[PDB]
Amino acid sequence: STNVLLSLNDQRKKDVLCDVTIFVEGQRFRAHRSVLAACSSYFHSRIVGQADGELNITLPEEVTVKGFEPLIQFAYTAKLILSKENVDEVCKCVEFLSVHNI
Amino acid sequence: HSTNVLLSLNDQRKKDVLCDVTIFVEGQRFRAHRSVLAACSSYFHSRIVGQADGELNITLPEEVTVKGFEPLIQFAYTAKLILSKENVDEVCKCVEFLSVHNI
Amino acid sequence: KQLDLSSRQQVTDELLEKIASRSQNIIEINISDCRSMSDNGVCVLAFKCPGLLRYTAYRCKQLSDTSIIAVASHCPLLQKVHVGNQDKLTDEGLKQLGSKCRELKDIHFGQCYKISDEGMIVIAKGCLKLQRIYMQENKLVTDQSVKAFAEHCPELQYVGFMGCSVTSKGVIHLTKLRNLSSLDLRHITELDNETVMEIVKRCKNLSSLNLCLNWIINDRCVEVIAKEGQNLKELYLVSCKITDYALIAIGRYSMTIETVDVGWCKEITDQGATLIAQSSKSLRYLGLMRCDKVNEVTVEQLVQQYPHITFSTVLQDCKRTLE
Amino acid sequence: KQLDLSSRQQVTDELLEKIASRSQNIIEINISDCRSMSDNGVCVLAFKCPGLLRYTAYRCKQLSDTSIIAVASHCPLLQKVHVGNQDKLTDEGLKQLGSKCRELKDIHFGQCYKISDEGMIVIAKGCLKLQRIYMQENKLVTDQSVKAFAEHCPELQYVGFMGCSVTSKGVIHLTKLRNLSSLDLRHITELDNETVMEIVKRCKNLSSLNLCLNWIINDRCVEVIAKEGQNLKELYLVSCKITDYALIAIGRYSMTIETVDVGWCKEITDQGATLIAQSSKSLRYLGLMRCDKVNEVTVEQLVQQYPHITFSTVLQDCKRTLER
């Protein structure tokens, strides 16, 4: 639910009880298992094939960290925030991070 | 910076004074300036540059919806948007478009 | 005698039966943005129509076309027909409009995308006193809506067909009449440089050309427009794929002009504005727009460089605008 | 005996001199997410290499191919070589790894886009004792690594080919050996129904089939896997253009199954799921998610109706987390 979404959001922004770990350019996002499954079919491709408690994922060099940062908050809040400097790489509203056909 | 100019113009706009170009949507009047809408949406420069009148009255087709329309001007001014998942489709063009918009 | 009843909303539905009581000189009917009167409520006044000249009605969506039938069939004299955003304007109504009142000299049929070709020929055979022609993105306006019009009235001045469905061949034709004053091409398919060459060498008198939002035009057209442009006073170059080099050519080779509009161009230079500032006293277009990267030198130097000028840009307009 | 030095960051530079101070039997080297040592830092230990068995280094990006050269050149014995996403690893070192120790039995070289073909030939010739195969979205690995790789050592049990550039013309040949248990053909180019039938019927002893993110497979291939897949226990259907009628088909014609993953299917039937709810006896995997086409009666009633279904929606992985 909505408050469930917010509670999961805060628990993400506690750095505690995080399942999936996204490794982009040494930077490591820590997020859950179910939410990134809800977000982008590319990730749910690489998760559900494993029941491991701890997971690891890397992303192609094409996907930029600057455009990558807002996407996690997008997934967690279901909210749209954008700036005029950073649009072209997200120009499909299916968020089109480089490769990236869902 | 010129962004200071933009913010000052925005605050002046949000007083219903010094507003030059008036947009009309099924009765709602949204006031704004003359230069900025020319810089933003190519449908608007078409109807603007051809006149030198005092008070302008530009109407928009039913194709453009109000609900997405309010944040359009906001992103024209301050380049910041607020939006949730229910009202996305009539905006999914990422080059603004949404208007005619064969470029 | 002077209605000007625009933006009157729901104050006027049947009261017009009292205005037209002894007054027979209604010329200034203006009910734009009307939202109260209906078919019969406009038909009662259209019953008489004594010598109407300046009929104008913008954005009367609910208005029917029987009203245009009645206003055209009860007064053969008419001079201004500025209708507007009224939708569902049938092409039957224009038929009887142009058949009955054969004197009109000023039109405004923008944003009616069902008058694509027929209305042209209808008031193209008979009507000959027309002076100002204005449309909008009126879809399906073909090239056969153009050539079969300019052979009948040669005294046109304002030619307004922005964003229509026509090709360069029709605009090649308009070189015939030689009194055209202002040109309103938007969204055409590549009016060529030879075509503008002939249309300007033929039509010496020409005040304003738009060419707003043309992507296929080149820099050489404006290069040569100043080679022969004597009376030209304003160019409307927006979203044009220019090399931003015709500006020096028009600043050198043109001696009578005051406005040049370079709008949605991805390149804006400070040196160009500085050169146009003093290269010509008449060519002043330093109204910088969409210029993010700039310092604060202008607001600190041009104050004492130009102390007797109050300027005209949106940047500097801080005195009148507050009033 | 058990190094497990994973995620040591910048703590291990020269220390390994006393962990193996007298040691001659290090077999559990796992330095995954290493960020401290250098080529010297691996070559100092690589001098001896006493009987290494489970060499592993995930995401050790800074280490070079000389690391693999030294670690494969100094011990003919190796049992697990699961290196990680480490880049700038050419194929010349893998040549020597195949040349020296021809007894390796388990590999993992995902996210190393330098092993397109030559690594396949070199550790396909001499080495034979291989058992598990897993790769990642490593392109340029042409279809030569499949036709030619089922030729030599037929005992392999795990196969991993997600996101590679191999053609179905090699997928034809995987029907050879009957030892294979796991498939990872994610991101492939239209395996036929005939291909799926041959590989299922010949390879009777098959456990897990991946086929994730494949568009071109119709509903019929899934319709017909189940008629002969007996010991198959899980299938991973994601983003496939199925018509959601093979669900009842696998609930009718397949009884030995407990795990099935329906991925990003555009159309999901509710009545078919209703029938599968009571069709089989070994299915409690109701991880309902992306459930726009769902009612509030089945999901409200089966919570207490069936105490054998736990659910794992985002609504569920919060109570369990709160309990801990």
Side-chain angles (χ1 to χ4, degrees):
Chain A
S1 175
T2 65
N3 75 322
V4 176
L5 182 85
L6 277 296
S7 177
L8 288 153
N9 209 287
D10 186 74
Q11 288 293 330
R12 165 220 153 34
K13 295 187 290 293
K14 299 289 94 175
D15 198 31
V16 74
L17 194 149
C18 50
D19 294 331
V20 177
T21 313
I22 312 293
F23 272 24
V24 289
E25 281 306 328
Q27 188 275 331
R28 18 159 76 59
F29 282 94
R30 327 276 287 145
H32 308 335
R33 244 231 246 322
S34 301
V35 168
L36 281 71
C39 165
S40 172
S41 179
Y42 164 73
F43 286 138
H44 172 88
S45 67
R46 346 232 315 198
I47 300 299
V48 68
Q50 274 72 38
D52 305 332
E54 199 275 344
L55 303 147
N56 297 310
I57 307 176
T58 187
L59 270 297
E61 185 65 41
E62 289 185 344
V63 175
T64 186
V65 57
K66 61 99 176 180
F68 189 62
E69 162 46 69
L71 311 163
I72 303 311
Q73 270 78 16
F74 180 76
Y76 276 93
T77 63
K79 265 303 311 173
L80 284 175
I81 62 170
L82 194 48
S83 63
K84 65 186 168 64
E85 41 268 53
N86 63 7
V87 176
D88 46 347
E89 84 269 14
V90 191
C91 186
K92 196 48 153 34
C93 65
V94 77
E95 65 258 11
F96 203 66
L97 276 298
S98 299
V99 294
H100 189 283
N101 220 50
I102 62 170
Chain B
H1 192 254
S2 298
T3 308
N4 189 359
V5 190
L6 266 73
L7 212 63
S8 55
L9 292 180
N10 188 359
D11 191 294
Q12 192 80 231
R13 140 192 148 40
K14 65 180 73 174
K15 310 271 176 39
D16 189 358
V17 76
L18 280 77
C19 55
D20 198 0
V21 170
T22 311
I23 311 296
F24 286 84
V25 287
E26 62 87 20
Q28 194 274 342
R29 13 163 79 60
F30 187 68
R31 325 275 281 140
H33 293 337
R34 216 226 228 313
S35 284
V36 165
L37 279 72
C40 175
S41 302
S42 178
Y43 163 76
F44 289 143
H45 198 118
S46 87
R47 352 239 324 197
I48 288 304
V49 76
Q51 271 74 31
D53 293 331
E55 168 179 351
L56 297 170
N57 311 301
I58 294 93
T59 300
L60 269 292
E62 178 64 48
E63 185 265 334
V64 180
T65 176
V66 291
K67 60 93 176 179
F69 174 66
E70 293 84 4
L72 294 174
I73 320 298
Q74 195 40 257
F75 214 80
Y77 272 112
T78 61
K80 262 76 167 200
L81 57 84
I82 192 76
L83 205 58
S84 64
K85 87 171 181 62
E86 71 263 15
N87 49 2
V88 176
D89 52 348
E90 295 172 355
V91 179
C92 273
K93 277 74 69 177
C94 68
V95 289
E96 281 68 72
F97 274 6
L98 194 147
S99 299
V100 175
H101 206 107
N102 203 341
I103 64 170
Chain C
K1 62 199 281 156
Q2 300 292 287
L3 280 196
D4 203 346
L5 188 153
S6 60
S7 184
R8 237 84 179 166
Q9 316 299 333
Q10 282 83 45
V11 180
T12 56
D13 53 357
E14 55 96 22
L15 198 69
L16 268 191
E17 65 184 1
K18 320 177 53 188
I19 297 89
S21 161
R22 352 197 219 296
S23 297
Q24 204 174 2
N25 49 3
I26 313 290
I27 294 91
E28 201 70 27
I29 185 168
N30 199 325
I31 313 154
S32 67
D33 284 283
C34 74
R35 226 75 257 220
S36 185
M37 269 182 167
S38 49
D39 174 70
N40 202 359
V42 68
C43 182
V44 286
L45 186 139
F47 205 52
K48 311 318 291 173
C49 294
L52 183 62
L53 301 179
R54 267 134 236 214
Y55 181 79
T56 59
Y58 289 111
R59 315 165 217 312
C60 280
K61 311 303 167 135
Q62 63 184 359
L63 183 63
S64 81
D65 288 328
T66 51
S67 176
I68 208 61
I69 293 170
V71 70
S73 69
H74 286 170
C75 53
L77 175 61
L78 262 174
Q79 185 177 182
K80 295 263 180 145
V81 74
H82 282 177
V83 306
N85 283 312
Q86 173 262 354
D87 289 332
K88 63 90 175 179
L89 194 154
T90 195
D91 213 346
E92 281 84 3
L94 196 152
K95 279 209 189 42
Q96 293 180 357
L97 187 153
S99 83
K100 302 312 279 204
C101 63
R102 22 163 74 193
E103 184 61 27
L104 183 63
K105 81 181 273 281
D106 206 307
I107 59 170
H108 187 289
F109 269 137
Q111 66 265 13
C112 300
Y113 346 95
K114 65 179 72 66
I115 310 302
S116 312
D117 196 284
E118 293 179 354
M120 172 295 268
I121 194 67
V122 168
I123 49 173
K125 299 289 94 175
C127 292
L128 191 145
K129 193 43 63 182
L130 276 167
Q131 283 193 359
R132 289 181 226 283
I133 58 171
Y134 187 86
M135 296 296 172
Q136 287 296 115
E137 62 182 1
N138 182 343
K139 305 307 153 202
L140 284 52
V141 173
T142 181
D143 288 334
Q144 188 274 331
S145 296
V146 174
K147 310 146 200 193
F149 186 76
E151 294 291 327
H152 289 286
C153 183
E155 74 257 4
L156 277 296
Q157 304 97 316
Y158 294 78
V159 161
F161 62 88
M162 61 195 77
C164 286
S165 177
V166 289
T167 306
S168 171
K169 285 315 313 184
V171 65
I172 293 178
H173 173 220
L174 277 296
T175 187
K176 268 197 174 184
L177 61 91
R178 269 164 223 126
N179 205 1
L180 192 48
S181 180
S182 173
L183 190 58
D184 191 359
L185 72 90
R186 291 188 216 125
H187 306 168
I188 193 66
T189 47
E190 178 43 41
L191 171 71
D192 207 305
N193 81 324
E194 178 65 42
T195 59
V196 307
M197 191 76 247
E198 284 296 329
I199 199 166
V200 178
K201 213 184 290 182
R202 281 236 202 2
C203 305
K204 276 74 68 178
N205 61 80
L206 195 55
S207 186
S208 67
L209 54 86
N210 292 323
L211 53 85
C212 172
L213 294 174
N214 263 11
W215 301 288
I216 193 66
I217 62 170
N218 58 5
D219 59 354
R220 197 64 136 331
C221 291
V222 173
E223 269 301 311
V224 67
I225 201 71
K227 188 62 65 69
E228 52 172 331
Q230 317 286 288
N231 62 78
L232 202 72
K233 300 294 187 291
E234 63 254 23
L235 283 74
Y236 302 138
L237 279 66
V238 293
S239 85
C240 52
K241 308 312 149 193
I242 53 172
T243 64
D244 189 358
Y245 186 69
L247 271 299
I248 185 53
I250 62 170
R252 276 190 186 289
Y253 280 119
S254 178
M255 81 305 288
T256 80
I257 190 167
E258 63 268 4
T259 312
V260 61
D261 297 343
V262 178
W264 219 318
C265 274
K266 268 67 56 184
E267 53 273 16
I268 297 92
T269 184
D270 195 5
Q271 184 56 257
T274 59
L275 279 189
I276 200 172
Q278 94 285 32
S279 193
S280 177
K281 301 287 103 177
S282 176
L283 276 300
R284 318 265 163 161
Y285 195 66
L286 284 85
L288 292 189
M289 191 265 268
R290 207 91 208 299
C291 305
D292 276 332
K293 197 54 182 171
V294 67
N295 218 0
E296 282 90 333
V297 175
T298 285
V299 300
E300 201 263 332
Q301 176 90 331
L302 268 76
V303 170
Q304 58 262 17
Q305 194 76 45
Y306 292 140
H308 66 269
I309 309 175
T310 59
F311 278 165
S312 176
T313 180
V314 299
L315 281 79
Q316 201 274 342
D317 279 334
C318 73
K319 294 182 280 281
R320 157 189 111 33
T321 54
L322 280 189
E323 182 180 1
Chain D
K1 63 203 282 155
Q2 300 291 286
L3 282 199
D4 203 346
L5 189 151
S6 58
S7 184
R8 227 82 181 166
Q9 313 296 335
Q10 287 84 45
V11 181
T12 56
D13 53 357
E14 55 92 21
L15 189 68
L16 277 191
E17 176 271 308
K18 317 181 53 187
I19 297 89
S21 161
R22 352 198 215 295
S23 295
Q24 283 71 239
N25 53 1
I26 312 290
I27 59 171
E28 199 71 28
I29 290 185
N30 192 326
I31 315 188
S32 69
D33 291 286
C34 76
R35 227 79 251 221
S36 185
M37 68 274 290
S38 50
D39 177 68
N40 202 358
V42 67
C43 83
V44 286
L45 191 142
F47 203 54
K48 312 316 291 174
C49 294
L52 277 296
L53 301 182
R54 263 135 232 215
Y55 176 77
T56 300
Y58 282 110
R59 312 161 218 314
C60 280
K61 302 290 180 68
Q62 86 277 23
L63 267 293
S64 78
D65 55 2
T66 54
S67 176
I68 200 67
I69 294 169
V71 69
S73 69
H74 289 168
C75 54
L77 182 61
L78 184 60
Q79 207 195 2
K80 162 190 186 223
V81 73
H82 292 171
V83 298
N85 298 321
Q86 64 183 357
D87 293 330
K88 70 180 148 43
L89 193 147
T90 190
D91 210 350
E92 279 83 3
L94 201 153
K95 276 207 194 44
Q96 310 221 349
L97 190 136
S99 84
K100 303 315 279 202
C101 45
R102 25 158 73 192
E103 57 87 23
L104 177 55
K105 82 173 271 283
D106 210 308
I107 71 159
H108 179 292
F109 283 53
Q111 297 287 324
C112 297
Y113 343 97
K114 275 79 68 178
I115 62 170
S116 308
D117 294 334
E118 299 297 323
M120 171 265 308
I121 198 68
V122 70
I123 302 159
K125 299 288 95 175
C127 170
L128 191 145
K129 188 51 51 194
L130 183 63
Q131 282 194 0
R132 282 189 223 281
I133 284 300
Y134 186 94
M135 289 312 198
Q136 207 85 346
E137 310 164 70
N138 183 349
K139 292 317 167 147
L140 277 74
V141 174
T142 189
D143 203 3
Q144 203 64 291
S145 166
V146 178
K147 179 258 184 181
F149 207 50
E151 299 292 327
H152 287 280
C153 55
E155 81 268 5
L156 270 62
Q157 305 94 317
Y158 291 80
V159 158
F161 291 140
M162 72 70 78
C164 287
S165 178
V166 290
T167 301
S168 170
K169 303 309 283 156
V171 166
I172 301 299
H173 282 136
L174 270 193
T175 189
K176 269 198 175 186
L177 59 88
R178 270 167 220 128
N179 293 319
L180 183 62
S181 178
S182 170
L183 277 297
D184 291 331
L185 72 165
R186 311 185 232 125
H187 274 238
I188 206 61
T189 317
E190 177 40 43
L191 71 167
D192 206 304
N193 73 73
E194 177 63 40
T195 69
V196 309
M197 294 298 102
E198 184 178 1
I199 195 163
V200 174
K201 65 178 72 66
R202 281 240 201 2
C203 305
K204 66 183 183 295
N205 188 18
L206 199 56
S207 185
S208 88
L209 184 55
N210 210 169
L211 53 86
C212 177
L213 284 182
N214 198 355
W215 297 282
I216 192 66
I217 302 315
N218 58 5
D219 208 11
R220 198 69 135 333
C221 291
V222 170
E223 282 268 337
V224 72
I225 298 298
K227 66 94 175 179
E228 49 170 332
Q230 57 281 64
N231 45 359
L232 184 63
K233 34 172 81 173
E234 72 286 43
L235 186 62
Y236 292 146
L237 310 93
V238 176
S239 84
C240 51
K241 298 292 213 202
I242 55 171
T243 62
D244 211 317
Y245 183 66
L247 184 144
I248 296 306
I250 201 164
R252 277 191 187 291
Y253 284 118
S254 175
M255 161 294 288
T256 62
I257 189 165
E258 66 276 2
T259 313
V260 62
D261 181 70
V262 175
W264 228 285
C265 289
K266 322 292 162 43
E267 198 78 344
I268 295 297
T269 187
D270 290 28
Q271 202 264 342
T274 310
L275 279 188
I276 193 66
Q278 57 268 14
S279 190
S280 179
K281 287 175 182 214
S282 69
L283 174 57
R284 346 276 157 170
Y285 209 68
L286 278 81
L288 277 178
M289 261 285 278
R290 214 96 206 294
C291 293
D292 284 329
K293 202 60 179 174
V294 74
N295 215 2
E296 303 91 17
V297 166
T298 285
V299 299
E300 207 268 344
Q301 184 82 330
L302 282 71
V303 174
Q304 67 252 15
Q305 189 71 46
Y306 298 148
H308 41 90
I309 312 174
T310 58
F311 289 89
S312 177
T313 186
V314 289
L315 183 63
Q316 183 275 337
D317 56 356
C318 71
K319 211 197 71 60
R320 147 179 92 27
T321 62
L322 269 194
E323 301 324 296
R324 78 165 38 221

